[PDB]
Design a protein around this ligand. Structure first.
Ligand SMILES: *CC(=O)N1CCN(S(=O)(=O)c2ccc(C)cc2C)CC1
Ligand SMILES: *CC(=O)N1CCN(S(=O)(=O)c2ccc(C)cc2C)CC1
Lengths: 304, 304
């Protein structure tokens, strides 16, 4: 029992983190097989970052300008290419600690663990969600760029995020491991405003199931609702519209708890309309939206 | 910027987790050098757990009854002893992945990461605090016993917790790595009620500093208070008394922010007296007490 914001074990990713230095800029790289992945803004001066021409900046760079250090051992760079907003540094040594892995581009609402790193060294691990506005609400200081977001399926690390940007509002933007930004963000120091940070409704419902499973039940009510009725309330409260897909995804939690998804929606509806009245749900005074239905099943069943 | 509930990277502890089976009971062990540490209730039937005589139960056990598996490789047990509420299983092989480590008994209010494991396999990592009532609010299912709590200082893992018990109220009790329980808890299935779960006042203040540092300032007020005045309010709200020790510990955060500790106390006093009025602080609608001043400095400065 008990329910916690839980990150994947980070060991498999710890073994992949290196330091990339180009000129005076040091940040983190991901070493998988004989390639090191890093943010392309490693080639910029902070002067460059106002309106950088990456192709033009990269022409001035050779393999030997990219200083790649794995622990206190230097890797030999034997090639470099830009793919979207990442650099791929070909090194002469396959990472011996390379786990089974995939690159996946996640959808908004999907959760992942971040291994925050500085100078290729892990400092900590936390669980995030890709927000509906394609930001993440991270914890990233200068030198944390190249830190990666990931999921683990048993032995396979799915890398879904690399850290590039802090927006002027202190929220975070970055890329998949093909170096395409989530959302409309660019690796440029410019006016970049996030859209509406809406609540991930399906994640909130999953987390209400997790609460019932773990004994927190005070918010279960006598009511039900319809998808259309619920969605009217969700719109009003800047919650994502709930789809039949979401309902389907919540099926197993429905089945385990014997609470119909639409009943749980009516519980969520009353919470939105009436607030918590100073009560808490799983030690939170607001509606948590960074657990997926999959996250709830995993934690509540003890999958390794 | 941004501030997250952050666990230590778990890799160094991942490398220490094994499966211990005695009779029909499987749980987790910690393999450091040529010793495997596990909860002594591994020798119990759940029938035993009502009033177990561990010395008497252990007499019936031989080295070869303790089945220790590290990945899919069996370790040879060449000795066993009970130290308080843990078993030390001497194996014929030193754990090659043994990190630099210490056993430390932590104080209430101190924070640590848990690597939740099942069958010697890591499932996830989260950050806890040792509550003032010597419980932790964990996420532990059956098979999670032997999961460990730890801190890391650069290269040194300080193990502070091993998981043993869920109390009837779904909070968690366990031992240091010398197998002494935190609080008055016993490895027995009996009436065991937690005391008052008070709020860790110094941790809340640290977290208010973390908020100011990260731009959340709406709760800074025009007031100050005294330790004695503040402590009157803390008593009323089941907050731990604030000592000059706590004030001293908050000094660096005081210095960085230019907000006197006693001013921040008066801010906390108004929050206790007036509530958040539907506002949030670092994405929380209650006063977070599971960041230490040390945790705030570490995260806010990017220590690895
Ligand atoms: C994204 C990231 O973590 N970066 C990019 C900025 N550089 S830097 O070297 O230009 C730099 C900028 C500002 C400060 C205070 C310090 C540094 C090192 C670091 C990596
Ligand atoms: C503390 C812990 O995680 N334990 C102790 C209980 N045992 S068990 O094998 O007795 C057991 C009890 C109940 C269930 C549903 C399942 C098991 C395996 C597991 C380890």
């Amino acid at each position: 029992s008990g329910f916690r914001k839980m990150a994947f074990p980070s060991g498999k990713v710890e073994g992949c983190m290196v330091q990339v230095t180009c000129g005076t800029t040091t940040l983190n790289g991901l070493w998988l097989d004989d390639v090191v992945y890093c943010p392309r803004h490693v080639i910029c001066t902070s002067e460059d970052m106002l309106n950088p021409n990456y192709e033009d900046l990269l022409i001035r760079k050779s393999n030997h300008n990219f200083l790649v250090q794995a622990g206190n051992v230097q890797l030999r760079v034997i090639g470099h290419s830009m793919q979207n907003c990442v650099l791929k540094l070909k090194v002469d040594t396959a990472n011996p600690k390379t786990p089974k892995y995939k690159f996946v581009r996640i959808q908004p609402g999907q959760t992942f663990s971040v291994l925050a790193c500085y100078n290729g060294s892990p400092s900590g691990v936390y669980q995030c969600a890709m927000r509906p506005n394609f930001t993440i609400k991270g914890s990233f200081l200068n030198g944390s760029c190249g830190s990666v977001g990931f999921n683990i399926d048993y032995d396979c690390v799915s890398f879904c995020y690399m850290h590039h940007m802090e927006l002027p509002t202190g929220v975070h933007a970055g890329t998949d491991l093909e170096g395409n930004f989530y959302g409309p963000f660019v690796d440029r120091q410019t006016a970049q405003a996030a859209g509406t940070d809406t609540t991930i409704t399906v994640n909130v419902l999953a987390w209400l199931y997790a609460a019932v499973i773990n004994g927190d039940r005070w918010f279960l009510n006598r009511f039900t609702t319809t998808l259309n009725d619920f969605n009217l309330v969700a719109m009003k409260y800047n919650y994502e519209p709930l789809t039949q897909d979401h309902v389907d995804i919540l099926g197993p939690l429905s089945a385990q708890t014997g609470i119909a998804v639409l009943d749980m929606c009516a519980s969520l509806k009353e919470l939105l309309q009436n607030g918590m009245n100073g009560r808490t749900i799983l030690g939170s005074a607001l509606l948590e939206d960074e657990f997926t239905p999959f996250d709830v099943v995993r934690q509540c069943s003890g999958v390794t």
